Amino acid sequence: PVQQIGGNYVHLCLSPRTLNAWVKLIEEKKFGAEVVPGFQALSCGCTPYDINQMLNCVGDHQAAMQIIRDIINEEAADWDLQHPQPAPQQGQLREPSGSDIAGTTSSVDEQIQWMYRQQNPIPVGNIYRRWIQLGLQKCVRMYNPTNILDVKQGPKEPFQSYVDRFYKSLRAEQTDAAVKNAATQTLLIQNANPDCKLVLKGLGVNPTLEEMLTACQGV
Amino acid sequence: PVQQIGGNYVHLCLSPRTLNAWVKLIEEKKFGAEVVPGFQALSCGCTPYDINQMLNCVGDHQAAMQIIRDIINEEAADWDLQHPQPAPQQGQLREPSGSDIAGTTSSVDEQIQWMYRQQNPIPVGNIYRRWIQLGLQKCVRMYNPTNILDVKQGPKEPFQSYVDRFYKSLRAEQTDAAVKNAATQTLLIQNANPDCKLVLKGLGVNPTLEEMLTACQGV
Amino acid sequence: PVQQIGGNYVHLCLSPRTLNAWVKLIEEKKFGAEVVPGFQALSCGCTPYDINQMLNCVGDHQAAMQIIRDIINEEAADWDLQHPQPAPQQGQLREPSGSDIAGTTSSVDEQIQWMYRQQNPIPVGNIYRRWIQLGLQKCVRMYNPTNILDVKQGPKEPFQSYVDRFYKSLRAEQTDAAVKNAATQTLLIQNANPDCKLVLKGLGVNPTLEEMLTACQGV
Amino acid sequence: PVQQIGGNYVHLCLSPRTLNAWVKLIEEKKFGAEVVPGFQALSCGCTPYDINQMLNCVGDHQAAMQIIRDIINEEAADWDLQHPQPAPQQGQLREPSGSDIAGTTSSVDEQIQWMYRQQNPIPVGNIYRRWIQLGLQKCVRMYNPTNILDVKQGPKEPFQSYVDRFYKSLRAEQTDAAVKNAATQTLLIQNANPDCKLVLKGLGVNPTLEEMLTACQGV
Amino acid sequence: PVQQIGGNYVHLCLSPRTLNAWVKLIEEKKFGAEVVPGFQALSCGCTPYDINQMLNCVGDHQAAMQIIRDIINEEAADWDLQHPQPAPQQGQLREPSGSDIAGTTSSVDEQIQWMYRQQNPIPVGNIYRRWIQLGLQKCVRMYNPTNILDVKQGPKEPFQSYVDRFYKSLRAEQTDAAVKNAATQTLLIQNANPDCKLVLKGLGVNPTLEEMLTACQGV
Amino acid sequence: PVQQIGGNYVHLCLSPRTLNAWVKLIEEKKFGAEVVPGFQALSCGCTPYDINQMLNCVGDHQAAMQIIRDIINEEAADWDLQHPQPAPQQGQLREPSGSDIAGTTSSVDEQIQWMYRQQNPIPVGNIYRRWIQLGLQKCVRMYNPTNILDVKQGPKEPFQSYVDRFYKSLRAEQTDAAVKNAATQTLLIQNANPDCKLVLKGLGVNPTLEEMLTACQGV
Predict the structure, then answer these.
(1) Which of A42, B81, B83, F144 would staple F172 via disulfide (CB 3.0–4.6 Å)?
(2) Which cellular compartments is it found in (chains A, B, C, D, E, F) (predicted)?
(3) DSSP code of E86?
(4) Does E108 lie at the interface with F, CB-CB under 8 angstroms?
(5) Residues near E46 by Cβ (< 8 Å), separated by ≥ 6?
């Protein structure tokens, strides 16, 4: 992270506690949806230099890390098109390229200068965090064990259990379309078992989740 | 959370310790009544941005999380009726809608501005915490294994044990009516076993819990 | 707890560490005598708002929690008799009732005002802690497995072991009378086994614990 | 402990970490010699109020705690003889009795006043810590499994092992006399086995421990 | 590390937490690629004196530690050639040799002087960290269980699994050449099994990792 | 440790965390070479008073602790010869003897005065740490399971494994002579098995460790 000592902004060492919590999250949860807000929280206040330490401390899951790296490169390339950089005049620090934001071609002090300079500050750490989020969302989709369309209530599975599996798989899609609404509720009802579906059909148009759970308790 | 640096209020990163304690509470306790004060303590001093990280780090129990989301939307809609928002004049920050308080349509800095502005501060974090409490109370009711009306003392169950189960289920109702008083004490006596009920009938009108426990010890 | 920021006293969030230590104490020790100083230490510097979070985070043992609640109400009622409260003149904060000290009818900021106001400060947090101590002492008596009068040395039980059990049960009474003195020492000797009692009778009037342990070692 | 806020000395809450470490030390080590420096370290900077919380959080070993209490009373009585206290003139805080130093008849604020007053400060916390040390030393002797005089080298026990047991039991005496010197070394040699004793006799007068260990390696 | 007290820079004790995390990393991960960023993070802000404590606390793996020591000596010798040091005039601190940067011939205070002196500061801690990184990279290669050229997809091994093993071994090379590009992708395809290779051949020139994983899912 | 409050240097309580880490190091690692830098790190910034708490908290291994005590006494005696102390004139604090540096005849405040006095400060804590290091080095030699001269490669033991054992035993000597150089490398080659020795003989004069490991891989 960053700290202020005197009238200057200087690197603050990344906590080993934070670093270890990130490493444990990956080892234990293996790209469940919670990895996305997990990274956001644990990378809060970080420079790209700090973020790369977090990512490089992951010892396994290298296919997923490579996918993340590929998404970082796409966004880095897109950045260069949206913000081409004229050659720094008079020995002044350049404007950051995509690789600079990713921390591959920039130092910690350069990153801090862009982040905390008075005129036209660029939050390169927070931009890089956004790129990694997109990569992690691809990984959640990749590691999802059961696609939403294959979530079907078992003959004797409690309705509450089926609903848990349904919304977990729906969330694992990681898209704006895969959210609770009339269209996704239609699928939920459709893929319920015959006994529960018969009960759900009697609840009218667009019943609430609470109504559905109440009505199907014990069926 | 929030911190003061100079004469400005700025985001303070949420502690990984706090975040992990919340995640563990859900995984281990699974919506027992203690989840309500647990959230209150662990979300103390938080902005809606921080609170959403807490809620989104929950990997399972998505039916319950959806119920919470539904209650948040109801309260968000109710807020818009009670406090409609005129269009911000002169490039000034708008007054917050329900979605702004929930952190879905607002940034961390907007949340902090509403919370710490001099004129007419709005504690959007604490309002959002109240909405989530209502959602968690619904979940406690949902996860309650034994309804209060089905708590009946076994033939040879110690009276103290039965009382523990009774007040645990009573509390799990999460209502103003489900509290120790003459009416709920009447049910407690009613659903005691024949041996203990005979002893309790001799203690007069409205005996104290201590009197009931003393009188029934060993029966 | 409370903190000073500028010239104002404001709420300080309760540590999750402290909260978890309290919850673990109850789960693991189950109202052994150490629960009383345990609460005192862990509730140090707390407002009634903070204390209620501690108490409400207890998920089981609800008979005991209800006993505590009953003692709180008795002391709250007693407070209202000793300190009736005239109606606040001129929009000034009222003087606290029993329910205000218990945190049921007061906010955190009201509690802090009473605690840190210049004229006639009232330590409502420390008063409430005293009420809860009385409740916890009742619970220690309730959970005590062996009454002091039933602690009798076994035929071949080492004297040191018997003494441990005796003073543990004596302490579990939680009264001023149940303390080491000539009267309770008389019971200790009385309930020793024939072999140790014969040795203890030869030590004169009011022998010390060290003398008793030395004399009975190996008997 | 104590802290300075403004120009005043005020109580600092005892850390739950410290308190728990003390409780665990007793439960796990059960009055081995290390309990004495352990208490000293963990009670560093404490008032008698804080120290009593530490001691009262011990749930078992009440014979030992009573022995400690008896030693505290002896030292408290001795204090009253060495420093009788005239009656406080003019509503000024009294000079502390033995019971005041022990924290039984004094509050935290009285303890802090004696500790940090300008004229004739009395470190009541550190005096009380000395009294408890004397009590803990008695307990180490009591819990010692093998008296020094019964530590004898086995027929085939390695000399290094025997030496470990010897100095552990010697230390457990907790006296000035029970220390490594010519007299205690004479006993060590005396209670070695015939094979090692023959080797030790050839090392001259007052051989060093290193010489003894070197000479007996493998015998 | 270093701290400022008054107008002077003084040693800050290395945290036991950090030290223990380093020791555990070596014991548990045994020179997997993550040891390199792990050292970088855990040695952040350290002087050579602090770094040597970290390295010397490693109790096993002494062949690897000797390899690190050999690389340190090479870089130390190279430093002396690039920056020969004239004899300090007038009792002034010398310019640092290679052994001074390694902390073998310099004290903590000398290291801090070079690091924080106004004119021509030399970051000896960060230079030494670079030397150790080179040593750790050699160790990663040494401990790598499967050379990249021996990573071949099994008859029925899922393509995702094979890809994980491939990029883990590729990374374990620790060279600029061993990175995802057209040349290394050619090897990945080449060493896939007949069923997956047939599918991969139909994806055109330089297919993306995502395309390869999508195309081979379930083959 | 020490802290500055106002214009005065005062004792800072030793952290229970640090103390516990030292105790665990001894219990778990039992005088492996890492105990030496371990003590150095964990005793950083300590007074002799603090160091004695660390050493006295060790409950077992008393032969080793006595060896340490014997080395402390030798160095203490040597100090008195090198720095005899004239009698303090005019009620001024004496110059420290060997026993004062060891903390046996001095208080914490005396130790701090010597450490932080303006004229002729004496770092008694750091001098004492040096004495204990010498004692711990003797203990490492004592606890070493396999003497360097008895480390011989097994018929089918991998060369890397043999090298680990060799350098671990070499280091356990704790002398300037027992370091990697031409002479100790000669022994390493000499005590390799016939198959590896034949390979090593072909590598010329003074081959590097890397060359030896590369050449012998799989033999």
Answers:
(1) F144
(2) Virion; Host cytoplasm; Host nucleus
(3) P
(4) no
(5) E1, E14, E54, E125, E129
- Residue D41 contacts F where some CB pair is shorter than 8 Å: yes
Report the length, in residues, of chain E: 219
Question: Roughly what angle, to the nearest 10 degrees, separates helices F159-172 and F182-190?
Answer: 130
Using CB atoms within 10 A of its CB, is residue D79 exposed (0-12), middle (13-18) or buried (19+)?
Answer: buried
Question: Distance between CA atoms of B49 and B113, rounded to whole angstroms?
Answer: 13
Which stretches of chain E are assigned E, i.e. beta strand? 2-5, 8-11
| E37·A52 Cβ contact <8 A | yes
The identity of residue A191, as a single letter, is N
Q: Say whether residue E179 is in contact with chain A using an 8 A CB cutoff.
A: no
Label residue B19 exposed, middle or buried (CB < 10 Å: 0-12, 13-18, 19+). Answer: buried
Residue F38 Cα, gap to closest chain E Cα (Å): 6
Residues in chain D closer than 8 A to C45 (CB atoms): 13
Within an 8 Å CB–CB cutoff, is residue B34 touching chain A?
A: no
Query: Which residue is associated with the tokens 């941005």?
Result: B49
The reply to whether A150 touches chain E by the CB within 8 Å rule is: no
DSSP-assigned letters across all residues of C96-158: P-HHHHTTSS--HHHHHHHHH-SSS---HHHHHHHHHHHHHHHHHHHH-SS-GGG----TT--
- CA E210 to chain A, closest CA, distance in angstroms equals 7
Q: How many residues does chain D have?
A: 219
Q: How far apart are CA E85 and CA F96, in angstroms?
A: 40
Q: Which residues pair with F5 in a beta bridge?
A: F8
Write the DSSP string, D17-49.
HHHHHHHHHHHHHTT-TTHHHHHHHHTTT--HH
* Cβ–Cβ < 8 Å for D129, D46: yes
CB nearest E34 (choices: A58, A63, A66): A58
Report which of D188, D187, D192, D189 is spatially closest to residue D155, judged by C-alpha positions.
D192
Contacts with D142 from chain C: Cβ below 8 Å: 213
Burial of B87 (0-12, 13-18, 19+ CB in 10 A): exposed
* Fold category of A2-143 in CATH: Human Immunodeficiency Virus Type 1 Capsid Protein (1.10.375)
How many beta-carbon pairs below 8 A join chains D and F?
Answer: 61
Chain F residue with the nearest C-alpha to that of D32 = F59
- Coil, strand or helix at C54: helix
Test B13 with A44 for CB contact under 8 angstroms.
yes
